[PDB]
Amino acid sequence: HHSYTWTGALITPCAAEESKLPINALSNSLLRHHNMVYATTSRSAGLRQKKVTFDRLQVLDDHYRDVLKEMKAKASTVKAKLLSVEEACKLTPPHSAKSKFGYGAKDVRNLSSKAVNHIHSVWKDLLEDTVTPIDTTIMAKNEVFCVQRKPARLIVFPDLGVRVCEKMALYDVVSTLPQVVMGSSYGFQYSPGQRVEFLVNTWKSKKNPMGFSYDTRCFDSTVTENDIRVEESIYQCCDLAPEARQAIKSLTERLYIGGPLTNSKGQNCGYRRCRASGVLTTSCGNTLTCYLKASAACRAAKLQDCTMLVNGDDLVVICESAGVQEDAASLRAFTEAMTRYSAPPGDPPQPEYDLELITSCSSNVSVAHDASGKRVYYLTRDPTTPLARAAWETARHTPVNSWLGNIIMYAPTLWARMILMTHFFSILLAQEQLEKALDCQIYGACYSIEPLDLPQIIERLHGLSAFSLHSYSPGEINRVASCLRKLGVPPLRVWRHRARSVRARLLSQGGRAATCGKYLFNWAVKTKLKLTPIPAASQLDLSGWFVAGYSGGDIYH
Numbered sequence: 415h416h417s418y419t420w421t422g423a424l425i426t427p428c429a430a431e432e433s434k435l436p437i438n439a440l441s442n443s444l445l446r447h448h449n450m451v452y453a454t455t456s457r458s459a460g461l462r463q464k465k466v467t468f469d470r471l472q473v474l475d476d477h478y479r480d481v482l483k484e485m486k487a488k489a490s491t492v493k494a495k496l497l498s499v500e501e502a503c504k505l506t507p508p509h510s511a512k513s514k515f516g517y518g519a520k521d522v523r524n525l526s527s528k529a530v531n532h533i534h535s536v537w538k539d540l541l542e543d544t545v546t547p548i549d550t551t552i553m554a555k556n557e558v559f560c561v562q563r564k565p566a567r568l569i570v571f572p573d574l575g576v577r578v579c580e581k582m583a584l585y586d587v588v589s590t591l592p593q594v595v596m597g598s599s600y601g602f603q604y605s606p607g608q609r610v611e612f613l614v615n616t617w618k619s620k621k622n623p624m625g626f627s628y629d630t631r632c633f634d635s636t637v638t639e640n641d642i643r644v645e646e647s648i649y650q651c652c653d654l655a656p657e658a659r660q661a662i663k664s665l666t667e668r669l670y671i672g673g674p675l676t677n678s679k680g681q682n683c684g685y686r687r688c689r690a691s692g693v694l695t696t697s698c699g700n701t702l703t704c705y706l707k708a709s710a711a712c713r714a715a716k717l718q719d720c721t722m723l724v725n726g727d728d729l730v731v732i733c734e735s736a737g738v739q740e741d742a743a744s745l746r747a748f749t750e751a752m753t754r755y756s757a758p759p760g761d762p763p764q765p766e767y768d769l770e771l772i773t774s775c776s777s778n779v780s781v782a783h784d785a786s787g788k789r790v791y792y793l794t795r796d797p798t799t800p801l802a803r804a805a806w807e808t809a810r811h812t813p814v815n816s817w818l819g820n821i822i823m824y825a826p827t828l829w830a831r832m833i834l835m836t837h838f839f840s841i842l843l844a845q846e847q848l849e850k851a852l853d854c855q856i857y858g859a860c861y862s863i864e865p866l867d868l869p870q871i872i873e874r875l876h877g878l879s880a881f882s883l884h885s886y887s888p889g890e891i892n893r894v895a896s897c898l899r900k901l902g903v904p905p906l907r908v909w910r911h912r913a914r915s916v917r918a919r920l921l922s923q924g925g926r927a928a929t930c931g932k933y934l935f936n937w938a939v940k941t942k943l944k945l946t947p948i949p950a951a952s953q954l955d956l957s958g959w960f961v962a963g964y965s966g967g968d969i970y971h
C-alpha cells in the first residue's frame with residue numbers, strides 16, 4: 415500500500431527555473447536581506463519524492479463507520495446538476511495548461527470546435543470505460559519562501575480535456591456538498607472576518623474552552639484507496655443524473671484513486687495510489703476525509719463537545735475542557751486514533767487555552783481597536799512568506815499576484831496595510847497601472863481583480879473598521895517587528911512617509927484612485943478623515959467568493 419512507486423526517471427521542468435531572488439531598482443525599498451528569499455525548483459524534487467513515499471496502514475473501527483453513516487445521511491439531501499460544456503469551459507483559467515491534443519485554455523474559453531469536440535470525446539470515453547487509468551503529469555511547483563530550505567512541493571494533474579469534464583460532472587457537487595455535510599464546520603464558506611466570528615463564537619460557546627490545531631504529515635500521501643472510494647460513496651448519496659453517476663464512478667476509478675505519473679518530457683515517472691494534488695476534488699475530498707477522520711477520533715478520544723473547523727487538510731478543534739491533565743491525555747488519544755485512520759501528525763498537537771494562540775490555515779485570531787476604541791477581532795498571520803513573495807513579485811511578473819490576494823484576505827492587519835498597500839500602490843502609480851486587472855487566488859480559485867476596486871472589496875469583506883484599526887496586540891506587533899528585522903524591511907517612519915506621498919498622488923487623480931488614497935492610507939496622516947460607506951461597494955458581485963475551496967482544481971472567475 416505504497417503512496418507512490420517510482421521508475422527512476424526525473425521530475426523535469428517545463429521551463430527555465432530561478433531559485434535566487436531576482437533584484438531590480440525597487441527591491442531595496444521593500445527589503446535588504448535578499449539572500450533570505452528563495453524559490454523551490456525541480457532540483458529538489460527527489461527530496462520531496464522521498465518524503466511523500468511511504469506505506470499506509472488503516473484500521474477502521476465503529477466510530478469511523480458511525481460518523482460516515484451520519485455524513486452520508488446529510489449528503490443524501492443534496493441535489494446536484496451537470497454543468498454544460500459551455501459552463502465548464504467558462505470556469506477554465508485563461509492561462510491554464512494547454513491540452514496535449516492540439517488546443518489551449520483560450521480555445522476552451524472561446525468554445526472552439528477543436529476544443530469542444532475533444533471534450534465531448536473525453537466525456538464519452540468516461541461513460542464507456544470505467545477501468546483504464548488516466549494519464550497525469552507530475553511537476554515540481556516553483557514557490558517562494560524565506561529560509562528557515564524546503565524541497566519543492568509536487569503537483570499532479572490530468573490533461574485539460576479531462577479537467578473540463580471534471581467540472582461538468584463535479585463542480586456543483588464540490589461547491590454544494592461540503593457545507594451540507596459539515597455545516598458550520600466547513601471552513602471555505604467563510605470570509606476571513608466570518609471565520610474569526612465563528613472561532614470566537616465557538617470559543618465563547620464553551621464553559622471552559624480548549625482548542626488545538628492538528629497538522630497531518632503530508633496529508634495527500636496519507637489518503638488511501640479506501641478513503642477515495644469512501645469519498646465517492648458520499649458523492650453518490652447526492653440526487654444526481656444517471657449520466658453524472660457514471661462519470662463520477664469513472665473519474666474515481668480512473669483518476670482519483672490513482673494512475674501513472676508522466677514528466678514534462680513524456681517519460682513514465684511512476685505510479686500514484688494517493689490523492690492527486692491537482693484535480694477538482696482535491697479540496698472537497700481532503701475536507702471530507704479530514705472531517706470524517708477527526709470526528710471519529712474525537713469520539714474515540716472522548717473529547718467533550720468537539721466543534722471542528724476544517725479547510726482541506728487544515729484542522730482546528732475547539733471543545734469543552736476536562737482539566738489540563740485530562741485534556742492532554744485526550745489529545746494523545748485523538749492522535750493515536752488519527753494515526754490508526756492513516757492521518758499521523760507532523761508536529762504533535764498541543765492544547766491551547768488562549769484562542770489567539772491557535773494557528774490554523776497559517777492564521778490566527780488577534781485583536782485591535784477601531785476608531786471608536788472598541789475591540790475588534792480580525793484574522794492575521796506571520797508576514798514572512800507574504801513579504802518574501804512580495805519581494806519576488808516586485809522584480810518579476812508572475813501568474814498569481816500573492817500581494818493582491820494577501821491585501822484582500824489580510825486587509826485589517828498591521829503588515830498588509832503598512833507595507834503591502836504602500837509598496838504596491840507606489841509601484842502601480844509609477845507605471846500608471848492602477849486600472850490593470852491582475853490575477854490572484856482566493857481559497858485556490860483564480861480571480862481577475864482591478865486594484866482600484868480594493869477599497870470597496872475590503873469594505874464588503876471586512877467592514878469600515880479595516881481602515882481604522884490601531885492599538886494592535888503586543889504579540890502581533892512583536893511578530894511583525896521581528897519579521898521586518900529578519901528580512902531587512904524599512905521602519906515605520908519610512909512607510910508612513912511613502913504612504914503620505916502615495917495618498918497625495920492618488921487623491922489628485924479623483925475617481926476610484928482618490929477613494930484608494932482616502933481609505934487605504936487614512937492611517938498615515940496626522941488629521942484622520944472620518945470614513946464613510948462607499949456607494950459603489952454594493953455593486954460588486956461577491957456571491958461565489960467564499961462558498962467553497964478549489965485548491966488545485968483549475969477554477970477561474
Ligand SMILES: CC(C)N(c1cc(C#CC(C)(C)C)sc1C(=O)O)C(=O)[C@H]1CC[C@H](C)CC1
Nearest residue numbers: 828831832883884885886891894895905906937
Ligand atoms: C502606535 C502607532 C504609532 N501605530 C502603530 C505602529 C505599530 C508598529 C510597528 C512596527 C514595530 C511593527 C514597525 S503598531 C501601532 C498601533 O496602533 O498598534 C499606528 O498608528 C499604526 C501605524 C500603521 C497603520 C497600518 C496602523 C496604525
